Amino acid sequence: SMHLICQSGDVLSARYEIVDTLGEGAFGKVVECIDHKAGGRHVAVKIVKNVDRYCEAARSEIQVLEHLNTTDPNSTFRCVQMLEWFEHHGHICIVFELLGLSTYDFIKENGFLPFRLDHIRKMAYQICKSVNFLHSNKLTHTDLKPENILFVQSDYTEAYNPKIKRDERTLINPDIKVVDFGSATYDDEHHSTLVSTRHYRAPEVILALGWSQPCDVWSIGCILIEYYLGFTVFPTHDSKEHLAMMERILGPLPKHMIQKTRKRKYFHHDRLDWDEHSSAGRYVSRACKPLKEFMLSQDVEHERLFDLIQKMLEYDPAKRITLREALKHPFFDLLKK
């Protein structure tokens, strides 16, 4: 159905001519359009599936972005700018400023290579600043992941690197914006039991212990390590295995969280019910290892980044570093005058 209305050359709302598809998600797709009203300026138009779940998210997003874009009209805090919304053949469509590739797609197109540390520093700072602005306004994003962090411009330079015997892309400008506010939840609204894309999901969410702003900090930690390594650190699609990967990289879960959860199926006698000597078990043991062993250098700047990641990946959300504190971490000192 969407297929029929999202084609190159189609005109939306008597104004936006589709150029082609930028990306696709469970919610629908985002297409690049020429805005014939605004002199031909290109914009991004998100076309939402005509399915209750995604319509409701889209309506919620529209409310959240009107609030954020009004509170911060210049995008000082780097939330994407929504321009307008309309309906096309029964689909909600939301128009945004046109950005570049997601950080995820950039990594993927570069053969799953990591970003350079100086870029990670800048991107991390901006992600923290942006999501902290949400947290200051009684909001939790709940779905932070590299697909939802987009470069303002994703242009790169490309040269043969003799060291790794392959061509390699170097990002020119690492500035980012945060997108997708369809799951963003206010402190005083209903909190769904399940949030976040699995790989970025906090342990309090997996264990259904209740969540708030700290779950975003966990997701960010997962994003940073992925920017450093070039790959997803919890790539599994199974909750128990995910928890087993956590234990191998970060150590055992806190006993008090284990005791409090209603997800008894993961546990036996307050320990993860996980056979380490099963095949899945041996894979987890050989693929995963303690966090600091992932470091590619012992240089102090790498140590600083890993200290920050370690603090973001604190199991107990009440002890996890806040984004206000993260912005003052030494890893960011090089950014300051």
Ligand SMILES: CCCNc1nn2c(-c3ccc(O)cc3)cnc2s1
């Ligand atoms: C499909 C993966 C990306 N997901 C989303 N992208 N966006 C966008 C968006 C995408 C590309 C742009 O140039 C500008 C804005 C807005 N809301 C969302 S959810």
